[PDB]
Amino acid sequence: KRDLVQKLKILRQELSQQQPQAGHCRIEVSREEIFEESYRQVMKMRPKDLWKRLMIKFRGEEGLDYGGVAREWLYLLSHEMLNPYYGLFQYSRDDIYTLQINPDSAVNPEHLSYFHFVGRIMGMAVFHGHYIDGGFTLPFYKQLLGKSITLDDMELVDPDLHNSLVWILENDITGVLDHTFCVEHNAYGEIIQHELKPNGKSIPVNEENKKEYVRLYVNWRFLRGIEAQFLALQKGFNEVIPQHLLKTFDEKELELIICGLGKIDVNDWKVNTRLKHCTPDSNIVKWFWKAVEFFDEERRARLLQFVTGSSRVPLQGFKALQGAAGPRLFTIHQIDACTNNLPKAHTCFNRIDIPPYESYEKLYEKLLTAIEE
Numbered sequence: 001k002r003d004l005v006q007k008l009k010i011l012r013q014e015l016s017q018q019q020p021q022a023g024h025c026r027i028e029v030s031r032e033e034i035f036e037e038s039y040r041q042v043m044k045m046r047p048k049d050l051w052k053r054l055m056i057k058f059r060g061e062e063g064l065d066y067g068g069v070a071r072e073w074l075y076l077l078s079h080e081m082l083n084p085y086y087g088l089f090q091y092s093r094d095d096i097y098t099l100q101i102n103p104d105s106a107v108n109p110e111h112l113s114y115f116h117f118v119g120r121i122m123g124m125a126v127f128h129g130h131y132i133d134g135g136f137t138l139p140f141y142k143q144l145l146g147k148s149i150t151l152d153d154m155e156l157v158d159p160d161l162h163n164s165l166v167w168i169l170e171n172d173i174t175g176v177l178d179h180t181f182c183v184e185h186n187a188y189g190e191i192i193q194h195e196l197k198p199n200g201k202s203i204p205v206n207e208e209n210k211k212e213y214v215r216l217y218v219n220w221r222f223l224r225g226i227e228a229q230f231l232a233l234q235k236g237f238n239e240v241i242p243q244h245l246l247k248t249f250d251e252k253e254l255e256l257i258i259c260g261l262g263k264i265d266v267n268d269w270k271v272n273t274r275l276k277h278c279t280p281d282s283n284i285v286k287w288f289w290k291a292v293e294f295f296d297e298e299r300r301a302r303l304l305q306f307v308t309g310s311s312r313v314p315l316q317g318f319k320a321l322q323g324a325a326g327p328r329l330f331t332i333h334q335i336d337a338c339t340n341n342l343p344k345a346h347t348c349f350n351r352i353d354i355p356p357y358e359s360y361e362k363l364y365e366k367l368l369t370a371i372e373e
Protein backbone atom coordinates (compact mmCIF):
# COMPACT_ATOMS: atom_id res chain seq x y z
CA LYS A 1 0.00 0.00 0.00
CA ARG A 2 2.86 2.38 0.97
CA ASP A 3 4.69 1.87 -2.37
CA LEU A 4 1.51 2.77 -4.36
CA VAL A 5 0.71 5.84 -2.17
CA GLN A 6 4.27 7.12 -2.77
CA LYS A 7 4.08 6.56 -6.60
CA LEU A 8 0.74 8.42 -6.67
CA LYS A 9 2.29 11.39 -4.77
CA ILE A 10 5.15 11.53 -7.28
CA LEU A 11 2.69 11.29 -10.19
CA ARG A 12 0.47 14.14 -8.86
CA GLN A 13 3.61 16.29 -8.28
CA GLU A 14 4.91 15.73 -11.85
CA LEU A 15 1.45 16.44 -13.37
CA SER A 16 1.09 19.74 -11.42
CA GLN A 17 4.31 20.94 -13.18
CA GLN A 18 2.71 20.24 -16.58
CA GLN A 19 -0.15 22.64 -15.64
CA PRO A 20 0.54 26.16 -16.95
CA GLN A 21 0.62 28.93 -14.36
CA ALA A 22 -1.54 31.21 -16.59
CA GLY A 23 -4.67 30.65 -18.72
CA HIS A 24 -7.77 28.49 -18.43
CA CYS A 25 -9.47 25.63 -20.27
CA ARG A 26 -12.88 27.16 -21.05
CA ILE A 27 -15.82 24.87 -21.80
CA GLU A 28 -19.46 25.99 -22.20
CA VAL A 29 -21.90 23.13 -22.88
CA SER A 30 -25.57 22.24 -22.38
CA ARG A 31 -26.30 19.33 -19.98
CA GLU A 32 -28.64 17.80 -22.62
CA GLU A 33 -25.91 17.78 -25.37
CA ILE A 34 -22.89 17.30 -23.01
CA PHE A 35 -21.21 14.68 -25.24
CA GLU A 36 -21.47 16.39 -28.60
CA GLU A 37 -20.87 19.92 -27.38
CA SER A 38 -17.83 18.86 -25.29
CA TYR A 39 -16.56 16.98 -28.36
CA ARG A 40 -16.72 20.12 -30.53
CA GLN A 41 -14.98 22.34 -27.98
CA VAL A 42 -12.30 19.90 -26.71
CA MET A 43 -11.30 18.83 -30.26
CA LYS A 44 -10.60 22.47 -31.25
CA MET A 45 -8.02 22.65 -28.39
CA ARG A 46 -4.36 21.73 -28.50
CA PRO A 47 -2.89 19.23 -26.02
CA LYS A 48 -1.34 22.11 -23.97
CA ASP A 49 -4.79 23.72 -23.55
CA LEU A 50 -6.10 20.59 -21.75
CA TRP A 51 -3.56 21.01 -18.91
CA LYS A 52 -4.91 24.48 -17.94
CA ARG A 53 -7.21 25.21 -14.95
CA LEU A 54 -10.77 24.34 -15.86
CA MET A 55 -13.31 27.11 -16.28
CA ILE A 56 -16.58 25.31 -17.05
CA LYS A 57 -20.09 26.60 -17.48
CA PHE A 58 -23.31 24.72 -18.18
CA ARG A 59 -25.40 26.61 -20.80
CA GLY A 60 -28.27 28.64 -19.32
CA GLU A 61 -26.89 28.01 -15.79
CA GLU A 62 -25.15 30.30 -13.33
CA GLY A 63 -23.37 27.66 -11.22
CA LEU A 64 -22.24 27.85 -7.54
CA ASP A 65 -18.42 27.78 -8.02
CA TYR A 66 -16.05 26.87 -10.88
CA GLY A 67 -14.35 24.01 -9.00
CA GLY A 68 -17.67 22.26 -8.42
CA VAL A 69 -18.89 22.79 -11.98
CA ALA A 70 -15.59 21.40 -13.35
CA ARG A 71 -15.98 18.30 -11.08
CA GLU A 72 -19.59 17.84 -12.25
CA TRP A 73 -18.82 18.25 -15.98
CA LEU A 74 -15.86 15.82 -15.82
CA TYR A 75 -17.87 13.21 -13.89
CA LEU A 76 -20.98 13.55 -16.11
CA LEU A 77 -19.14 13.54 -19.44
CA SER A 78 -16.77 10.64 -18.47
CA HIS A 79 -19.80 8.49 -17.67
CA GLU A 80 -21.95 9.73 -20.59
CA MET A 81 -19.28 9.06 -23.28
CA LEU A 82 -19.39 5.34 -22.29
CA ASN A 83 -23.12 5.11 -23.25
CA PRO A 84 -23.59 2.63 -26.14
CA TYR A 85 -25.95 5.17 -27.77
CA TYR A 86 -22.96 7.15 -29.10
CA GLY A 87 -21.65 4.09 -30.99
CA LEU A 88 -18.16 3.94 -29.41
CA PHE A 89 -18.55 1.35 -26.67
CA GLN A 90 -20.95 -1.50 -25.88
CA TYR A 91 -21.53 -4.17 -23.21
CA SER A 92 -20.22 -7.66 -23.96
CA ARG A 93 -22.93 -10.20 -24.95
CA ASP A 94 -21.10 -12.96 -22.95
CA ASP A 95 -20.26 -10.70 -19.98
CA ILE A 96 -23.24 -8.36 -19.45
CA TYR A 97 -21.23 -6.08 -17.02
CA THR A 98 -18.09 -5.64 -19.19
CA LEU A 99 -17.68 -2.51 -21.32
CA GLN A 100 -15.70 -2.85 -24.59
CA ILE A 101 -15.04 -0.92 -27.80
CA ASN A 102 -17.80 -1.41 -30.44
CA PRO A 103 -15.98 -3.20 -33.35
CA ASP A 104 -18.54 -1.80 -35.88
CA SER A 105 -18.01 1.82 -34.68
CA ALA A 106 -17.00 2.72 -38.28
CA VAL A 107 -20.73 3.02 -39.21
CA ASN A 108 -20.09 6.67 -37.99
CA PRO A 109 -17.33 7.79 -40.41
CA GLU A 110 -15.93 10.27 -37.84
CA HIS A 111 -15.58 7.51 -35.17
CA LEU A 112 -11.76 7.86 -34.86
CA SER A 113 -11.95 11.54 -33.97
CA TYR A 114 -14.56 10.60 -31.32
CA PHE A 115 -12.28 7.90 -29.80
CA HIS A 116 -9.45 10.51 -29.80
CA PHE A 117 -11.79 12.82 -27.87
CA VAL A 118 -12.70 10.06 -25.30
CA GLY A 119 -8.95 9.42 -24.80
CA ARG A 120 -8.45 13.15 -24.09
CA ILE A 121 -11.28 13.02 -21.53
CA MET A 122 -9.88 9.90 -19.81
CA GLY A 123 -6.52 11.71 -19.71
CA MET A 124 -8.22 14.81 -18.21
CA ALA A 125 -9.92 12.62 -15.53
CA VAL A 126 -6.47 11.19 -14.56
CA PHE A 127 -4.99 14.71 -14.60
CA HIS A 128 -7.66 16.06 -12.18
CA GLY A 129 -7.49 12.98 -9.89
CA HIS A 130 -10.81 11.32 -10.84
CA TYR A 131 -11.02 7.54 -10.32
CA ILE A 132 -13.79 6.27 -12.64
CA ASP A 133 -14.95 2.60 -12.71
CA GLY A 134 -15.67 2.62 -16.44
CA GLY A 135 -16.31 -1.12 -16.63
CA PHE A 136 -13.49 -1.99 -19.04
CA THR A 137 -11.41 -5.15 -18.44
CA LEU A 138 -8.02 -4.92 -16.65
CA PRO A 139 -6.06 -5.76 -19.88
CA PHE A 140 -7.95 -2.86 -21.66
CA TYR A 141 -6.70 -0.46 -18.94
CA LYS A 142 -3.17 -1.91 -19.08
CA GLN A 143 -2.97 -1.37 -22.84
CA LEU A 144 -4.14 2.24 -22.37
CA LEU A 145 -1.55 2.81 -19.60
CA GLY A 146 1.30 1.42 -21.76
CA LYS A 147 1.64 -2.06 -20.29
CA SER A 148 2.31 -5.06 -22.51
CA ILE A 149 -0.54 -7.59 -22.91
CA THR A 150 0.39 -11.03 -21.50
CA LEU A 151 -0.64 -14.61 -22.39
CA ASP A 152 -2.13 -14.70 -18.81
CA ASP A 153 -4.58 -11.96 -19.96
CA MET A 154 -5.88 -14.23 -22.76
CA GLU A 155 -7.46 -16.67 -20.25
CA LEU A 156 -10.81 -14.81 -20.11
CA VAL A 157 -10.65 -13.23 -23.63
CA ASP A 158 -10.35 -16.59 -25.48
CA PRO A 159 -9.99 -19.64 -23.17
CA ASP A 160 -9.40 -22.23 -25.93
CA LEU A 161 -6.75 -20.07 -27.63
CA HIS A 162 -5.09 -19.44 -24.25
CA ASN A 163 -4.73 -23.23 -23.58
CA SER A 164 -3.38 -23.79 -27.12
CA LEU A 165 -0.77 -21.03 -26.81
CA VAL A 166 0.27 -22.17 -23.29
CA TRP A 167 0.63 -25.69 -24.81
CA ILE A 168 2.90 -24.29 -27.61
CA LEU A 169 5.20 -22.56 -25.10
CA GLU A 170 5.39 -25.45 -22.62
CA ASN A 171 5.81 -28.45 -24.94
CA ASP A 172 7.87 -29.53 -27.99
CA ILE A 173 5.49 -28.73 -30.98
CA THR A 174 7.68 -30.30 -33.72
CA GLY A 175 5.63 -32.23 -36.26
CA VAL A 176 2.41 -31.75 -34.22
CA LEU A 177 1.71 -28.00 -34.63
CA ASP A 178 1.50 -27.30 -38.40
CA HIS A 179 1.29 -23.51 -38.43
CA THR A 180 2.87 -20.41 -40.01
CA PHE A 181 3.11 -16.69 -38.93
CA CYS A 182 -0.24 -16.11 -40.66
CA VAL A 183 -3.54 -16.18 -38.75
CA GLU A 184 -6.96 -16.35 -40.35
CA HIS A 185 -10.15 -14.83 -38.97
CA ASN A 186 -13.64 -14.26 -40.32
CA ALA A 187 -14.45 -10.57 -40.34
CA TYR A 188 -17.99 -9.73 -41.63
CA GLY A 189 -18.32 -12.93 -43.75
CA GLU A 190 -14.87 -12.73 -45.36
CA ILE A 191 -11.79 -14.77 -44.33
CA ILE A 192 -8.86 -12.45 -43.65
CA GLN A 193 -5.38 -13.97 -43.80
CA HIS A 194 -3.26 -11.74 -41.53
CA GLU A 195 0.54 -12.07 -41.44
CA LEU A 196 1.88 -11.49 -37.91
CA LYS A 197 5.22 -10.32 -39.39
CA PRO A 198 6.77 -9.78 -42.90
CA ASN A 199 6.78 -12.96 -45.05
CA GLY A 200 4.68 -14.68 -42.30
CA LYS A 201 2.84 -17.00 -44.73
CA SER A 202 6.16 -18.66 -45.62
CA ILE A 203 7.60 -18.95 -42.07
CA PRO A 204 6.64 -22.12 -40.17
CA VAL A 205 6.28 -21.97 -36.39
CA ASN A 206 9.03 -24.12 -34.80
CA GLU A 207 10.87 -24.46 -31.45
CA GLU A 208 13.24 -21.51 -32.20
CA ASN A 209 10.54 -18.95 -33.19
CA LYS A 210 7.48 -20.15 -31.14
CA LYS A 211 7.99 -17.57 -28.31
CA GLU A 212 7.82 -14.73 -30.89
CA TYR A 213 4.80 -16.40 -32.58
CA VAL A 214 2.90 -16.57 -29.27
CA ARG A 215 3.78 -12.92 -28.36
CA LEU A 216 2.70 -11.57 -31.79
CA TYR A 217 -0.46 -13.76 -31.71
CA VAL A 218 -1.45 -12.49 -28.21
CA ASN A 219 -1.04 -8.81 -29.34
CA TRP A 220 -3.06 -9.31 -32.53
CA ARG A 221 -5.87 -11.32 -30.86
CA PHE A 222 -6.29 -8.76 -28.07
CA LEU A 223 -6.96 -5.80 -30.46
CA ARG A 224 -8.56 -7.83 -33.31
CA GLY A 225 -11.21 -5.69 -35.07
CA ILE A 226 -10.61 -2.66 -32.81
CA GLU A 227 -7.01 -1.68 -33.79
CA ALA A 228 -7.86 1.81 -35.17
CA GLN A 229 -10.27 2.68 -32.33
CA PHE A 230 -7.78 1.71 -29.63
CA LEU A 231 -4.94 3.63 -31.32
CA ALA A 232 -7.11 6.82 -31.49
CA LEU A 233 -8.10 6.43 -27.80
CA GLN A 234 -4.39 5.90 -26.79
CA LYS A 235 -3.35 8.95 -28.86
CA GLY A 236 -5.93 11.17 -27.11
CA PHE A 237 -4.92 9.84 -23.71
CA ASN A 238 -1.16 10.34 -24.28
CA GLU A 239 -1.80 14.00 -25.21
CA VAL A 240 -2.82 14.64 -21.55
CA ILE A 241 -0.83 11.99 -19.63
CA PRO A 242 2.76 11.34 -20.74
CA GLN A 243 3.41 7.60 -21.02
CA HIS A 244 6.84 7.94 -19.29
CA LEU A 245 5.07 9.10 -16.09
CA LEU A 246 3.27 5.73 -15.67
CA LYS A 247 6.15 3.20 -16.28
CA THR A 248 6.74 2.96 -12.50
CA PHE A 249 3.25 1.48 -11.81
CA ASP A 250 2.89 -2.32 -12.01
CA GLU A 251 -0.18 -4.43 -13.06
CA LYS A 252 -1.31 -5.08 -9.44
CA GLU A 253 -1.17 -1.34 -8.62
CA LEU A 254 -3.19 -0.45 -11.75
CA GLU A 255 -5.86 -2.97 -10.71
CA LEU A 256 -6.21 -1.36 -7.23
CA ILE A 257 -6.37 2.15 -8.71
CA ILE A 258 -9.18 1.56 -11.26
CA CYS A 259 -11.24 -1.10 -9.51
CA GLY A 260 -10.64 -0.10 -5.85
CA LEU A 261 -10.48 -2.53 -2.89
CA GLY A 262 -10.57 -6.25 -3.87
CA LYS A 263 -13.39 -7.03 -1.40
CA ILE A 264 -16.39 -5.14 -0.04
CA ASP A 265 -16.02 -5.33 3.75
CA VAL A 266 -19.30 -5.15 5.76
CA ASN A 267 -17.40 -3.93 8.91
CA ASP A 268 -15.77 -0.96 7.17
CA TRP A 269 -19.13 -0.29 5.44
CA LYS A 270 -21.25 -0.23 8.64
CA VAL A 271 -18.90 1.94 10.78
CA ASN A 272 -18.87 4.55 7.91
CA THR A 273 -22.65 4.78 7.36
CA ARG A 274 -24.87 7.75 8.35
CA LEU A 275 -28.29 6.98 9.83
CA LYS A 276 -31.41 9.15 9.08
CA HIS A 277 -34.71 8.61 10.99
CA CYS A 278 -33.35 5.34 12.48
CA THR A 279 -31.08 4.74 15.48
CA PRO A 280 -27.91 2.61 15.81
CA ASP A 281 -29.70 0.00 17.94
CA SER A 282 -32.93 -0.16 15.84
CA ASN A 283 -34.28 -3.35 14.22
CA ILE A 284 -34.16 -1.85 10.71
CA VAL A 285 -30.39 -1.10 11.01
CA LYS A 286 -29.65 -4.47 12.67
CA TRP A 287 -31.60 -6.32 9.90
CA PHE A 288 -29.93 -4.29 7.17
CA TRP A 289 -26.39 -5.21 8.34
CA LYS A 290 -27.40 -8.83 8.98
CA ALA A 291 -28.54 -9.00 5.29
CA VAL A 292 -25.32 -7.34 4.01
CA GLU A 293 -23.21 -9.72 6.12
CA PHE A 294 -25.03 -12.74 4.52
CA PHE A 295 -24.59 -11.19 1.03
CA ASP A 296 -21.70 -12.61 -0.95
CA GLU A 297 -19.21 -10.41 -2.93
CA GLU A 298 -21.54 -10.39 -5.99
CA ARG A 299 -24.62 -9.34 -3.99
CA ARG A 300 -22.63 -6.66 -2.05
CA ALA A 301 -21.42 -5.20 -5.38
CA ARG A 302 -25.04 -5.14 -6.67
CA LEU A 303 -26.10 -3.38 -3.44
CA LEU A 304 -23.25 -0.83 -3.60
CA GLN A 305 -24.01 -0.14 -7.32
CA PHE A 306 -27.75 0.20 -6.55
CA VAL A 307 -27.18 2.82 -3.83
CA THR A 308 -24.11 4.72 -5.17
CA GLY A 309 -23.91 4.17 -8.94
CA SER A 310 -20.69 2.16 -8.65
CA SER A 311 -19.40 -1.07 -7.08
CA ARG A 312 -15.86 0.44 -6.70
CA VAL A 313 -14.75 0.83 -3.04
CA PRO A 314 -12.19 3.64 -2.64
CA LEU A 315 -8.69 2.56 -1.53
CA GLN A 316 -9.32 4.26 1.87
CA GLY A 317 -12.64 2.41 2.30
CA PHE A 318 -16.17 3.67 2.92
CA LYS A 319 -15.05 6.74 4.91
CA ALA A 320 -13.84 8.12 1.48
CA LEU A 321 -17.18 7.41 -0.33
CA GLN A 322 -18.20 10.28 -2.63
CA GLY A 323 -21.46 11.60 -3.97
CA ALA A 324 -22.23 14.24 -6.61
CA ALA A 325 -20.83 17.42 -4.89
CA GLY A 326 -17.92 15.77 -3.03
CA PRO A 327 -17.65 13.56 0.09
CA ARG A 328 -20.89 11.70 0.91
CA LEU A 329 -21.02 8.78 3.35
CA PHE A 330 -23.32 5.81 2.59
CA THR A 331 -26.71 6.64 4.19
CA ILE A 332 -29.60 4.52 5.50
CA HIS A 333 -32.77 6.57 5.64
CA GLN A 334 -35.84 4.94 7.23
CA ILE A 335 -38.82 6.43 5.33
CA ASP A 336 -42.51 6.52 6.25
CA ALA A 337 -43.76 4.43 3.29
CA CYS A 338 -45.82 1.23 2.47
CA THR A 339 -43.88 -1.84 3.70
CA ASN A 340 -44.59 -3.68 0.42
CA ASN A 341 -42.47 -1.12 -1.56
CA LEU A 342 -38.90 -2.02 -2.41
CA PRO A 343 -35.96 0.05 -1.03
CA LYS A 344 -35.36 3.18 -3.14
CA ALA A 345 -31.91 4.55 -4.06
CA HIS A 346 -30.68 8.14 -4.51
CA THR A 347 -27.23 7.63 -6.09
CA CYS A 348 -26.50 11.39 -5.86
CA PHE A 349 -26.32 11.23 -2.06
CA ASN A 350 -25.28 7.48 -1.73
CA ARG A 351 -28.59 7.01 0.08
CA ILE A 352 -31.04 4.13 0.53
CA ASP A 353 -34.63 4.75 1.60
CA ILE A 354 -36.13 1.92 3.57
CA PRO A 355 -39.74 1.37 4.70
CA PRO A 356 -40.30 0.09 8.28
CA TYR A 357 -40.29 -3.67 7.38
CA GLU A 358 -41.94 -5.90 10.00
CA SER A 359 -39.26 -8.62 10.02
CA TYR A 360 -35.63 -9.40 9.04
CA GLU A 361 -36.90 -11.90 6.42
CA LYS A 362 -39.06 -9.22 4.77
CA LEU A 363 -36.14 -6.71 4.64
CA TYR A 364 -33.84 -9.44 3.31
CA GLU A 365 -36.19 -10.44 0.43
CA LYS A 366 -37.18 -6.84 -0.52
CA LEU A 367 -33.51 -5.75 -0.60
CA LEU A 368 -32.65 -8.79 -2.75
CA THR A 369 -35.59 -8.07 -5.15
CA ALA A 370 -34.54 -4.42 -5.44
CA ILE A 371 -30.89 -5.24 -6.32
CA GLU A 372 -31.82 -8.07 -8.83
CA GLU A 373 -30.96 -7.96 -12.58
Ligand SMILES: CCOC(=O)c1c(C)[nH]c(C(=O)N(CC)Cc2ccc3c(c2)OCO3)c1C
Nearest residue numbers: 078122125126129130131132134246249257258
Ligand atom coordinates in the same frame (compact mmCIF):
# COMPACT_ATOMS: atom_id res chain seq x y z
C1 LIG B 1 -1.34 4.90 -12.96
C2 LIG B 1 -1.89 6.03 -12.06
O1 LIG B 1 -3.30 6.14 -12.37
C3 LIG B 1 -4.01 7.19 -11.93
O2 LIG B 1 -3.46 8.11 -11.32
C4 LIG B 1 -5.46 7.25 -12.25
C5 LIG B 1 -6.39 8.19 -12.00
C6 LIG B 1 -6.37 9.50 -11.23
N1 LIG B 1 -7.51 7.81 -12.56
C7 LIG B 1 -7.44 6.71 -13.25
C8 LIG B 1 -8.64 6.07 -13.84
O3 LIG B 1 -9.62 6.12 -13.07
N2 LIG B 1 -8.73 5.50 -15.11
C9 LIG B 1 -7.58 5.42 -16.04
C10 LIG B 1 -7.77 6.13 -17.41
C11 LIG B 1 -9.98 4.83 -15.46
C12 LIG B 1 -10.97 5.75 -16.18
C13 LIG B 1 -10.84 7.16 -16.20
C14 LIG B 1 -11.76 7.97 -16.88
C15 LIG B 1 -12.82 7.30 -17.50
C16 LIG B 1 -12.97 5.92 -17.43
C17 LIG B 1 -12.04 5.11 -16.82
O4 LIG B 1 -14.09 5.45 -18.09
C18 LIG B 1 -14.44 6.70 -18.80
O5 LIG B 1 -13.84 7.90 -18.20
C19 LIG B 1 -6.19 6.25 -13.09
C20 LIG B 1 -5.64 4.95 -13.65
